[PDB]
Symmetry: C3
Subunit: 125 residues, 3 copies
């Protein structure tokens, strides 16, 4: 069974995709960007932007019968790898106890010209 | 069991990889590029190029006992994010009913200097 | 059950992540870079750098009750796609018999300004 996930506490998915999709115990979360649930961009520091991305992921996971503690793998895409040090401070605050596998890469550009995008693969609770 | 997949209706894999690999109900499809099954590049619009990538994915999925409707997650890599609007028109045509999770990023370069690469994770029918 | 993996025969993970994480038969390996297990960068040819990345992945897999022969999907990120030909020679040497699915993309930058990063998804033996 493939089950799409929708929450009002993350920016809405466009017509062609879902915020997350569940398949046999796994939860695949779409790449989250620094936008509020009302679909407005977060302006400010990378730290503020990272915190929004984390809240977006967390809320989609909660709707997926999952949580940060059930994440298996995180992929981080940064528009500028110079921002990695700052991003990592926020990342470490969230993954203080649970330590999923991770990959981080510097990309040329991201949707809507944002500074970061983060996708996650998790398991159901 | 890990089962490699081969179809003559997508560009052939090189010696070191498989077009797709199956593992416990999941199908992992290699990143598909805008090349025809005869291994020639598609020249033309991003729309034409995206349509070829979609046909490549669809045909590999069919050989994998899967289909577009069984996709869990799509990752789109674009050489230029300015092409995203055009790409999205084609994407939305295919994912008109089934809405997998998605991530899209702008990369510096792609194999054989192509404009787009798309990988997919699916489940068996 | 989510089980983190640690080996002394790959560069140590930082505090916020694990070298690999196991979840229901799958092993998700963090993106490996050309650093030795003593956390020093490999200087030299792309071939030498690729060989180090391969040894890092192999050793994490071994600690994960897996191996190269149990890999389902490989994602290769290169800081310069001009290095792909050279990388591929090393890749083909390792995947001489087992042929997982693969995606390869050229990125803007990688952690610690390295030339390549490779992540892998595998199954347990």
């Amino acid at each position: 069974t493939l089950t799409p996930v929708s929450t009002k506490l993350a920016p809405p998915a466009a017509a062609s995709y879902s915020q997350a999709m569940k398949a046999n115990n796994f939860v695949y979360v779409s790449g989250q960007i620094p936008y509020t649930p009302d679909n407005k961009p977060v302006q400010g520091s990378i730290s503020e932007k990272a915190e929004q991305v984390f809240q977006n992921v967390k809320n989609i996971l909660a709707e997926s019968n999952s949580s940060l503690d059930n994440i298996v793998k995180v992929n981080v895409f940064l528009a500028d790898m110079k921002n990695f040090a700052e991003f990592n401070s926020v990342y470490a605050k969230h993954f203080h106890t649970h330590k999923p596998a991770r990959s981080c890469v510097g990309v040329a550009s991201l949707p809507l010209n944002v500074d970061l995008e983060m996708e996650v693969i998790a398991v159901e609770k």
